[model samples]
Target: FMEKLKTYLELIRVKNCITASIGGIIGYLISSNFEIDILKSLLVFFVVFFVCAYGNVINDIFDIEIDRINKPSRPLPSGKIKLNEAKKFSAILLILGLVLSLFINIYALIIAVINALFLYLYAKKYKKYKPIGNFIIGYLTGSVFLFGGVAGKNVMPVVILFLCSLLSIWGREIVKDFEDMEGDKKEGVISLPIKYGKKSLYFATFLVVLAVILSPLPYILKIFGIWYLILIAICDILFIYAMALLLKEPNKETASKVSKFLKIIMNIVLLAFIVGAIKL
Candidate 1:
């Protein structure tokens, strides 16, 4: 029985579900202004949690074939969980996720639905359109902050946080798409370079600078503090460096190199929030 239970957790990626839900908790803390409201907070937490869990299972369902070659140990491909059984599990997680969102409020209901929809679409149908796919991911990733803010009966406070996070990831995704474009043989999708043009690198650069310009607002506005300033400055420098890397060479190999730096910057931004949210 415990072995079966472990497989279920494996299918959903229990570790990621827990870590990503921390985004919702951070969002909740900000909107509530650091005052703990256990009941509502717990509700928001699970709303994101169950939905995130749903995303993982559904993704594995669609990508089972890919996993068969790439990761045979995964539950779906390994036959630890039957296909129909996994689908049913996905349904339960999504259903429970939305119900939990309903407990938060209207904004969360829509946010939950959009996130769930995009996850489904990104996994199943829209994978062909790289630009569309990347944008949807940015929205889903950024909106977790919006979700918690709205859950606290206010979303205005986390607005900058959401915007910059979205831009950071979205812009970062375009370059990564460029990096992976060939392997993305991968995708007849509208890759920035393949579909748009080489000059699309300039647009991508614009996005990173815009995010950097806005990163300091939270500090200037005093919503966060000195630590936020310090942490986010690191993000700013790293992003600028990434942009220069792309700008200097502006090719697939260059972007792939820059892509690693962008991932590091994204994590530091997350750190600014959780640490800066409370400290000076």
Candidate 2:
């Protein structure tokens, strides 16, 4: 049973859950004004991880058809878990996530619900809606940090972190669309890359790049400090350069490689928020 549990956990990508949870923790810690209750902090981390993981499970279930086509080897499409089983698992995670949130506050429960709803809406509906959908998806991605702030009662810092999340995720999502263009086309989905064509793909990437590049505003305006700027700069440059290089090629293989690399870079970059925030 432990081995099976581990397999399913791995299948759902627990590493990502941990990474995102840590980012939220860092954001909260940096934003906190020296009030460090370890127990409360740990509870926040657990709730964030549970909810984010629940989001991933629901995403997988909703994307089962797409996964069957674009990622047949994934747990859902590969028959490692039945469709019904996957749904049940998602429900359990979501309930656990909400119950955990209740231990924190009503605000946290609302945030969890919003997170879950947005995750489902994005996977099932927004993803096919093009630019608008992508932007909301980005907004929600950024909101995780802000959500933490609200849960922790630090509004301003959360807002800044939220802005950072939005831009970073927006750029990544655009690149992801470019990476999945072929499969998206085959599946009859209207991704930004597919809708605007290659030229539009370049355009969208450029716009997203501009957003990411401009993301240091909150930090520079006394919200954060040099450390935040430095980390944001590194993340911005890495993504901008990757996007530029990928645009030159614009094929699935190259874009996919760059997209994967961007995700890794983003994980590292988000950690800097806490490092910079605390030092300030």
Candidate 3:
């Protein structure tokens, strides 16, 4: 039973789901002026969590063949879970997420519906193309902040964080394209690294990272205080380091490592936002 539960959690990419949930919660927190409505915030968090899990599961289901080559140990490719069961699970999560969004407001419901459809479309089609799927995933990630803001009836901090998240995620997605280039080519998926040369993709990734490095200036200039600036400066430095690493050794292993590191940096940036918002 425990093993089965673990498989299900793995299928949902639990860590990523948790990260998505936290993004929504952070949105609620910043927008609610540090005084959150617990029930509503949790509802939004879980809605984001389940919807993200649905997205992850559906991606796994669709990518089973690709995963067999690049990530055969995953639940679907490894045969830990059946495809039909995964589909059923994803449907349940999607329905639950949308239903919960309705309780928040019409805006939240609309956002949820749109995101759900986007996730589906991304897994079914967009993921096969270069940069389009990357942007779709990044947009979905950034929208969690906006969704939470709408739930709390404020969007000031959410907007800044959304841009930061968008730029960072987009850059990381490009790096992942580098990591998966071999499998992507084998699968006939036209990712940035496959469509453009690696040098071109790295240049694009660097540009996005530069945008992310500048994204915190709004907070440093007026919205937030010294603490935010200091932490964001640290995040900027890390982004630079990641970019340098990618440029210095633009290989699958290096790209994968830097992409993982960027995820950690994003979480640090999230903490910076929290501190800044609370201090404000």
Candidate 4:
């Protein structure tokens, strides 16, 4: 029973959900003048976290076949969880998230519903298309900050974060398409890497470069201090390095490695934001 519980948590990607919750908490912190409304912020965090977990579960439910080819160890593909049970679990999460959002505000509820709908569409259909699926995933990821801002009734600090996140995530999503090319192609899913092949690398590079260019905006706009500039500069340098690596190799394995590296860079960038928000 404990093992089965673990499988269900894995299916929901509990760690990623926690990260999403952190994003919401950060958003609340930055937007709320560091006043720390413990109750409201915690509500926003859990709401976003649960909704994101719901999305992950639904995506897994749809990607069971793909997982069998690419990641057979996943709960659904490994037969550790039944399909109907997963679906029911996702439905419960969705309801819980929406119900939690209602207490936050009308805007929060609206964003929750819209994001949930986007998750449904992405899992059911968008993921089969090249680039569109990537865009949707990026949008959803970036919007977490915006959702946090709304919960705190302040959107200013999160704006640059949102744009930077969108660009970074879009680039990573393209690289992920490269990493999953074999399974996606066999599954007849037309991802950019599958359809455009190496050409997709250039697009991914473009997005990362754009993110690097925009990384300084918070400091430039005087929203953050010198510390933000210093830290974000480091992130930009690393992104440039990753871009160069991707351009030099532009293969599935390289893309996969670079994608993982970019994730680490993103976390560092998030820290930069927090430092900026607190110090400046």
Candidate 5:
């Protein structure tokens, strides 16, 4: 039973939860001048992870049908876990995540509830709904950074980082939509690519890239110094280059690689924040 539970946890994508939480913590650390309250930070981190994991479980539960057709080996669709069991598991995680947030702050409580609510909405109504849905998902992805900032009381920097996270995730989500077009079509779902075609995808992709490029303005305007700009410039160039490559090659494998690379760039961006903060 313990092994099975571990497998189910793996299916919830625990590593991604950790990665996202770390990004949040890095943002908080930079914004808070590296003065971390270790206990509070860990509490916030686990809360974020639990909520994110719950979201993934809920997604899988909702996506079982599509998985059976498009990805049959997934836990739920393959019968490694029953749908009812998954839902129950997700509910418990969601509740516990929210409860933990209250230990940090009231703001954390609000954020936790919002995240959980939106995850349910995203899975139930948004995933198949195209551009708007994609936007909501992207925005939520970025919210993790802000959540960290709020928990640590670092508002301004968190807002900027949130926007960066949003734009980056938005582009990646669009690319993913393109990659999943076939499965989406099979499920009678509408996506950006399936509805208005590649033009919509191209436009949204470009907009997201533009937003990402502009995200550095806050740091620059705040005069984080030439060293910071130089560091960010390198990171930004690599990001833009990847986006360019994504545009030129929209294949599934390439798109997936770009998605992973975007995540790497996010880590680099967070590091840039730390560098700038220290230089201050």
Candidate 6:
């Protein structure tokens, strides 16, 4: 029983849950102008966690076959969690995520419902459909900010973050598609790398480049200034390195390493946003 419970945590990807929730927190803070609301902020935090957990589980369920080859040790692919069990767990999480959102406001509820639908559709139908799958995943990440912004009763403040984060995640997911090319090919997944050949790494490169380009816009728009510039300037240095390393050696190993490397940079980019929020 103890081990069975642990499988659920692993399957839901606990670390990712925290990261997504952090995005929502930052969005919430910025939108409210750092005004602390115990009730709304708490709801936004748990909602993102549950929603992201559900997405990961459902995606794992659909990717069982592909993961067996690409990541055999994953809970679902390795038989650590039964399919029926994971299905029920994900359903519970999705419902709870939405129910929690309903208490925030209409806009938050709408975003939650749409995300729930998109998550289901992506797992069931679009996971193998080339760029659409990539887009769905990227939008989901970016929308954490949107979800928080709406809950905080202002969406405009987080718009810059939404766009920049969207592009960064797009780059990461595309490279991950590259990392899974072999399994994706065997499972008949039509990721860009499999469909257009290794040259498709350029698409990932372009998105990362695009993210770096977008990084300065927050300062340009007067949304966030010198502090944001400081953190973003340093972060962009490593951001391109992730893109360059993968572009130079477009193979599974390099793709895998670069994907992880990009995640580190993305989180620091999150810190850049945090510092941008300060009055001092």
Please give each candidate's TM-score.
0.89, 0.74, 0.79, 0.83, 0.80, 0.78
Compare the candidates by TM-score and give the number of the best one.
1
Error at 77, model 2, angstroms? 5.0
> RMSD, each candidate, Å?
2.3, 4.0, 3.6, 3.1, 3.4, 3.8
Compared with the true structure, all predictions reach lDDT values of 0.83, 0.73, 0.82, 0.87, 0.78, 0.84
* Candidate 2 Cα lDDT to native: 0.73
Q: Write the per-residue lDDT of candidate 1 for residues 1-280, one digit (tens) a residue.
A: 9999999999989898887688888888877777769998888888888999999999999999989999799999998899999999999999999988888778889989989999998889667677787778788888888888887644565778788878878888888877776776554566776776667778788888998998888778767788888998877887898798788887877888788878877888877877766742
Clashes of each: 1, 0, 0, 0, 0, 0
After superposing candidate 5 on the true structure, give the runs of residues whose Cα lies further than 4 Å from its correct spot. 69-75, 78-80, 176-187, 209-213, 221-223, 234-267
Worst 10 residues of 2 by lDDT: 27-36
Candidate 4: worst-modelled 10 consecutive residues by lDDT: 151-160
Error of 5 at 112 (Å): 1.5
Q: Which stretches of candidate 2 lie over 4 Å from their true place?
A: 33-35, 63-82, 127-133, 198-214, 219-221, 229-272
> lDDT by residue for model 6 over 16-99, one digit each (tens)?
999989879889987876876999989999999999999999999888987988879999878888899899999999999989
Better of 2 and 5 by lDDT: 5
Model 1: lDDT equals: 0.83
Instruction: For candidate 3, write residues 131-226 as lDDT tens digits.
Output: 788888778988999889888755766877887777778778888888888887887888777867676556556656666666666565586778
Model 1 lDDT, residue 255, Cα? 86
Model 1, residue pairs in steric clash: 184-187
Error of 1 at 164 (Å): 1.0
- In model 5, the Cα lDDT at residue 235 comes to 78
106-158: candidate 2 lDDT, tens digit per residue = 77788788888887787677777767677777777776676567656456766
Candidates ranked, most accurate by lDDT first:
4, 6, 1, 3, 5, 2
**Top lDDT: which candidate number?**
4
